[PDB]
Amino acid sequence: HLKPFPPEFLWGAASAAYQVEGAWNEDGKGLSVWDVFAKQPGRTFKGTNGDVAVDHYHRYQEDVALMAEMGLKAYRFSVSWSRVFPDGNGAVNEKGLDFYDRLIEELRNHGIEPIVTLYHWDVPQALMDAYGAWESRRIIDDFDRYAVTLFQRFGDRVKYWVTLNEQNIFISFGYRLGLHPPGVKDMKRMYEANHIANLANAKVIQSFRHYVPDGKIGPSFAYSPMYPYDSRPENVLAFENAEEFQNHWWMDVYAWGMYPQAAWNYLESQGLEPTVAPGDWELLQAAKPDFMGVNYYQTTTVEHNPPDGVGEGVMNTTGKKGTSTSSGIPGLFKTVRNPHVDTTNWDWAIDPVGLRIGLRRIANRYQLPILITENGLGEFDTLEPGDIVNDDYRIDYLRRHVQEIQRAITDGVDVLGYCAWSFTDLLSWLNGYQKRYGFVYVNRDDESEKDLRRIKKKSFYWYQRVIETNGAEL
Amino acid sequence: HLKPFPPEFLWGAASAAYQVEGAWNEDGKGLSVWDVFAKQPGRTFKGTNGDVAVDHYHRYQEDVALMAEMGLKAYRFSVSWSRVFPDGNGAVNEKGLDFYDRLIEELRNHGIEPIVTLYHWDVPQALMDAYGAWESRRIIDDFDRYAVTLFQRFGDRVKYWVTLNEQNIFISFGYRLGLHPPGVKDMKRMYEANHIANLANAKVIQSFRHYVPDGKIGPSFAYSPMYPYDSRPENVLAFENAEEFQNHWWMDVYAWGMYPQAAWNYLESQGLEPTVAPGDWELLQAAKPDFMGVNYYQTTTVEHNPPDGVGEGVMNTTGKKGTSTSSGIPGLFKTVRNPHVDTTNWDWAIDPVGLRIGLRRIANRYQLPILITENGLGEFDTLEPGDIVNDDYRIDYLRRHVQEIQRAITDGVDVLGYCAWSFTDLLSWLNGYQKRYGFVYVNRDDESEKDLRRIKKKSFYWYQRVIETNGAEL
Ligand SMILES: O=P(O)(O)OC[C@H]1O[C@@H](O)[C@H](O)[C@@H](O)[C@@H]1O
Ligand SMILES: O=P(O)(O)OC[C@H]1O[C@@H](O)[C@H](O)[C@@H](O)[C@@H]1O
Numbered sequence: 047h048l049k050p051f052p053p054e055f056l057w058g059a060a061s062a063a064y065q066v067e068g069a070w071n072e073d074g075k076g077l078s079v080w081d082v083f084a085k086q087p088g089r090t091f092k093g094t095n096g097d098v099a100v101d102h103y104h105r106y107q108e109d110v111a112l113m114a115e116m117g118l119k120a121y122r123f124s125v126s127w128s129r130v131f132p133d134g135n136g137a138v139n140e141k142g143l144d145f146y147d148r149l150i151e152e153l154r155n156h157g158i159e160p161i162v163t164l165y166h167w168d169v170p171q172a173l174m175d176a177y178g179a180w181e182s183r184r185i186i187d188d189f190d191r192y193a194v195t196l197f198q199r200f201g202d203r204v205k206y207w208v209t210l211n212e213q214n215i216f217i218s219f220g221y222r223l224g225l226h227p228p229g230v231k232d233m234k235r236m237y238e239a240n241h242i243a244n245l246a247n248a249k250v251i252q253s254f255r256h257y258v259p260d261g262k263i264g265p266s267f268a269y270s271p272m273y274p275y276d277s278r279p280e281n282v283l284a285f286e287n288a289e290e291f292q293n294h295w296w297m298d299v300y301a302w303g304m305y306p307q308a309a310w311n312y313l314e315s316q317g318l319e320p321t322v323a324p325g326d327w328e329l330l331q332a333a334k335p336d337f338m339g340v341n342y343y344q345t346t347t348v349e350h351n352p353p354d355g356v357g358e359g360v361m362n363t364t365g366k367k368g369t370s371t372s373s374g375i376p377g378l379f380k381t382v383r384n385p386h387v388d389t390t391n392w393d394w395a396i397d398p399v400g401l402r403i404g405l406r407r408i409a410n411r412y413q414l415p416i417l418i419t420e421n422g423l424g425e426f427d428t429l430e431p432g433d434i435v436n437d438d439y440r441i442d443y444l445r446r447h448v449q450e451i452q453r454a455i456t457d458g459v460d461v462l463g464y465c466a467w468s469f470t471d472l473l474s475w476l477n478g479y480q481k482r483y484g485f486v487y488v489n490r491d492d493e494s495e496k497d498l499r500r501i502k503k504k505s506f507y508w509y510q511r512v513i514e515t516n517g518a519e520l
Numbered sequence: 521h522l523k524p525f526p527p528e529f530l531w532g533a534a535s536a537a538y539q540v541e542g543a544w545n546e547d548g549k550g551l552s553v554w555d556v557f558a559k560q561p562g563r564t565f566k567g568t569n570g571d572v573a574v575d576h577y578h579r580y581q582e583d584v585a586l587m588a589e590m591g592l593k594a595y596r597f598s599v600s601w602s603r604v605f606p607d608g609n610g611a612v613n614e615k616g617l618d619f620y621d622r623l624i625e626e627l628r629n630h631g632i633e634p635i636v637t638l639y640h641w642d643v644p645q646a647l648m649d650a651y652g653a654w655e656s657r658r659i660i661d662d663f664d665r666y667a668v669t670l671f672q673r674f675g676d677r678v679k680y681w682v683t684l685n686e687q688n689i690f691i692s693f694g695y696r697l698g699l700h701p702p703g704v705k706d707m708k709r710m711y712e713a714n715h716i717a718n719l720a721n722a723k724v725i726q727s728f729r730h731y732v733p734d735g736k737i738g739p740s741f742a743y744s745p746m747y748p749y750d751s752r753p754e755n756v757l758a759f760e761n762a763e764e765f766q767n768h769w770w771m772d773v774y775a776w777g778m779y780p781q782a783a784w785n786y787l788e789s790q791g792l793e794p795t796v797a798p799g800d801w802e803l804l805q806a807a808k809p810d811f812m813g814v815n816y817y818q819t820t821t822v823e824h825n826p827p828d829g830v831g832e833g834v835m836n837t838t839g840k841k842g843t844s845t846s847s848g849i850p851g852l853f854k855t856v857r858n859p860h861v862d863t864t865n866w867d868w869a870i871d872p873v874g875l876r877i878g879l880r881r882i883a884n885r886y887q888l889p890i891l892i893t894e895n896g897l898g899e900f901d902t903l904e905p906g907d908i909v910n911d912d913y914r915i916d917y918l919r920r921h922v923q924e925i926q927r928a929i930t931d932g933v934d935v936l937g938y939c940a941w942s943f944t945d946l947l948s949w950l951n952g953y954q955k956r957y958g959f960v961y962v963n964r965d966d967e968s969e970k971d972l973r974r975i976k977k978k979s980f981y982w983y984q985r986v987i988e989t990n991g992a993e994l
Contacts, residue, residue: 279873282873282874286880290884294884386752400753403753
């Protein structure tokens, strides 16, 4: 017998500024590292970039009207740092703030709760130019100043805040895999910037307690819960290393203010552990969040990896299912295909029970409320005659995940809300447009920009009914 | 490259008073619940009991000399509460305290560190008669009077103390399985008694901070780390249930003063959650231990268990391999044979890497030092002419477990010592005498005490060499 979703459950949907806004140089916006990075030849699929994206900066009023039509309780979006401080640390651009003000007013005027994400990977290029951005402690006070500006300006209107979105992703992709700005492949630098990002997160949660005392705030972690392949003890030990190295490495710092000891020691033995200054541990431990943001898409199964074994694998860019290969850390663990779940054609696991497992792990380990900030299925959509997009695949994925959430709530996990990814189709950081996540189809592809018109998918109406029946009808 | 065992590592061996002492009615000792229980027909194998056991009460000088010959750094034993308070809570039996004084003096005169266990399952029968022993809050103050009696008498000479030894066993075997005193099969009563023992534990740790400010104290948990059968999400979820219900239910209280939420809610949904009094959480949270004691023998593998599925299983007390059957909680998990490890003739898994995994989990979850208070292999031994016992099976098991401890120390786990179970052969609570654990064979069986003579097994000389080289030579 399932509990119902609490009466004030935030049924949400989410975006990210670069992925959606466009207007990349209007009204005084400065350059971000993704403005520069995406125009480098060969970085992004068919040269796609966010100059226009889906042009939400100009079309937000139509976008919010579709949200109100849908009945969204909440909308999560990111603020573009380079719209607010074109220099990162110089004068504030009032036109930048004014757009987010207009967006929030538009949201409230329709009874939609705004959830403001502070950082979704778009640090101003000037700060990377001036001092290497996340590799310098100077970004801590610059990021604080930016966050305080938003707190003072929108705190009276925004209850829910997310600090850093998927810090493990932009640190990892940006400094170990070289796939994101700044395009670095250097684990020593990766963990230095990661540590500085941890301090930046902690500093702004501290500021938030001062400036928005009645608000709620937390980082959002890209969480892939680890599984052992089988009950072979070597495989279970590999799972212990993987969950601590991939997940606790970040979530223990968010929740407890301290890195896990075994992973630290392994980094120390390699000379990779971050530099620590007086006052770091005090700050990190004094910044408890109200919730743990969670972006979930899939679980990961691991097995034993000998000292000689797998390192970086082969990411699935194409869509040709089967093209991924095992990624690992020699001596600790390597990934392996989970024979008991389906995958998308991008080799992503379809594992809604894994969401319940991950929600249970966070509550069991930290006793924190959880806001699901991102969950969704990316797939090709066909526009059929009569403005019909039949994305039954997308409905099937979201339904099962929402079902497992309800089971998590019945187990006792405190789930504050759920933000499907995404509201409209949007620009993928690297893979262009044809892998869509939206409830609302946007009329463009990789070659033709067309007119960017919004078309309601079948999933739009499925999710309209979910919100109307507070989850009772799925 | 492995770290060495720390220079003050407590290389130990262990026993329990009922299992070893004998002299059940000598020198003013009162009856314990096990004196009474084991003499009820059908409770124990071939009617074996602790009347004589291996007569360590009279023979402790011989036994300590053998410890000294082996070069033991520490000896862990339990104090028989009914020797000290014959009626549990009245006047002290000075002769009872005097035995443990002579024992501790004998150990210190041979340079062996005593590790005193306060409770190893033998509450005096008179407290069971007066108010039902662990089922009544009365026991909190009675157990405290007894602990403080020991603290004041021996605190000057004993630095390392264990409170409750395997609370999860004597509570669940006593109140859920009906296999230990008081022979109850009632889940509601089991969790009430469990909660009272949590309070008794916290109360004496609190008293210890006053009476033995320089000592170190912890409970000792019977830890079987759980494994999922495979990466099937339903099986990983049964692992999450199993680890929380069987392990976190006790260790979270010991480390954090808090029961885990999902397990609590499942018990509440069944009317099984314990009665909580004002001030309980305050006491439980303000009694941090210096270490987590760990009794390890095996891991447990689990799979999905439907709500009509498995409950109590068949236990193996004979010695014929393949007799045990699955046990579980319907709707949460059930155990299953781990196909990737061997088992003993009693169906206990042999999983030395599981010890590393369990030690890693405790450090990762609680950041506590660990004292391994029990680990050993129980098997039939053959006494060969010339008083020779070749127990290579025991050496092999101890060697691989001690090896995995060093890998755990290298990972960063703070392991304070290792107490092999047991120093001499002793009486098994239910299994009689033939399932032997000792380094020192004791000449007796289930039918005759014979001359109870002590015979060093081959593993005696192996462990002697382990200690002499501080574990460099295994
Ligand atoms: O590469 P894909 O399939 O388009 O997935 C990208 C999505 O994956 C998530 O990790 C990001 O938070 C999103 O911003 C992004 O939309
Ligand atoms: O294997 P057996 O004979 O059932 O014994 C298990 C042993 O290990 C633990 O369960 C107890 O702490 C010991 O007292 C006991 O002797």
